[PDB]
Design an enzyme around this catalytic site. Structure first.
Site, PDB file in Angstrom:
ATOM      1  N   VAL A   1       0.915   2.141  -3.623  1.00  0.00           N
ATOM      2  CA  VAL A   1      -0.278   2.782  -4.164  1.00  0.00           C
ATOM      3  C   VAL A   1      -0.305   4.245  -3.760  1.00  0.00           C
ATOM      4  O   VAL A   1      -0.637   5.121  -4.566  1.00  0.00           O
ATOM      5  CB  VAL A   1      -1.554   2.056  -3.703  1.00  0.00           C
ATOM      6  N   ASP A   2       0.042   4.537  -2.509  1.00  0.00           N
ATOM      7  CA  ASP A   2       0.098   5.934  -2.093  1.00  0.00           C
ATOM      8  C   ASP A   2       1.396   6.598  -2.535  1.00  0.00           C
ATOM      9  O   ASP A   2       2.146   7.115  -1.701  1.00  0.00           O
ATOM     10  CB  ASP A   2      -0.063   6.053  -0.578  1.00  0.00           C
ATOM     11  N   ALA A   3       1.684   6.582  -3.838  1.00  0.00           N
ATOM     12  CA  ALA A   3       2.792   7.351  -4.395  1.00  0.00           C
ATOM     13  C   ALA A   3       2.281   8.584  -5.131  1.00  0.00           C
ATOM     14  O   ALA A   3       2.622   9.707  -4.760  1.00  0.00           O
ATOM     15  CB  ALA A   3       3.646   6.479  -5.317  1.00  0.00           C
TER      16      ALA A   3
ATOM     17  N   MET B   1       0.820  -1.208   0.000  1.00  0.00           N
ATOM     18  CA  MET B   1       0.000   0.000   0.000  1.00  0.00           C
ATOM     19  C   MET B   1       0.853   1.256   0.000  1.00  0.00           C
ATOM     20  O   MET B   1       0.440   2.295  -0.542  1.00  0.00           O
ATOM     21  CB  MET B   1      -0.939  -0.022   1.206  1.00  0.00           C
TER      22      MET B   1
END
Lengths: 57, 77
Positions: free
Chosen positions: B58-60, B55
């Protein structure tokens, strides 16, 4: 029922509906199966095969 | 002048899209994490390790987006 080479005993035993076998799963909090494709179609064959197996025994 | 009202809306649009993308892209991943857990809880710690490990990826892009949104809405105003 073959107990000993020196004694044998006739027995009439039930095989449907399934007798209770002290199969308590309290250790199996831990998991459940992945079923392919579904658990009911599997359970049917499992019960049929089990009856056949006990007749053979 | 009408710079600042449009600048406001530009950050609002970029960050709203960031919010939708991040929310859904993490919801899916967490849903699969939970349905993996429920079938065998004893793997909860390993799969939670994997869950965070993934995750964080994904939070980039949504983090970049929020950074630019705050910069525009305050630094550039």
């Amino acid at each position: 029922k073959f107990i000993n080479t020196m004694s044998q005993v006739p027995t009439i035993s039930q095989l449907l509906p399934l007798p209770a076998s002290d199969d308590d799963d309290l250790k199996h909090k831990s998991w459940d199966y992945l079923y392919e494709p579904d658990p009911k179609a599997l359970l049917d064959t499992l019960l049929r095969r089990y009856v056949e197996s006990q007749v053979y025994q | 002048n009408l710079n600042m009202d449009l600048l406001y809306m530009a950050a609002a649009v970029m960050m709203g899209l960031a919010a939708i993308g991040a929310a859904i892209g993490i919801g899916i991943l967490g849903g699969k994490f939970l349905e993996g857990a429920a079938r065998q809880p004893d793997l909860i710690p390993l799969l939670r390790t994997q869950f965070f490990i993934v995750m964080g990826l994904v939070d980039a892009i949504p983090m970049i987006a929020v950074g630019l949104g705050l910069y525009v809405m305050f630094a550039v105003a």
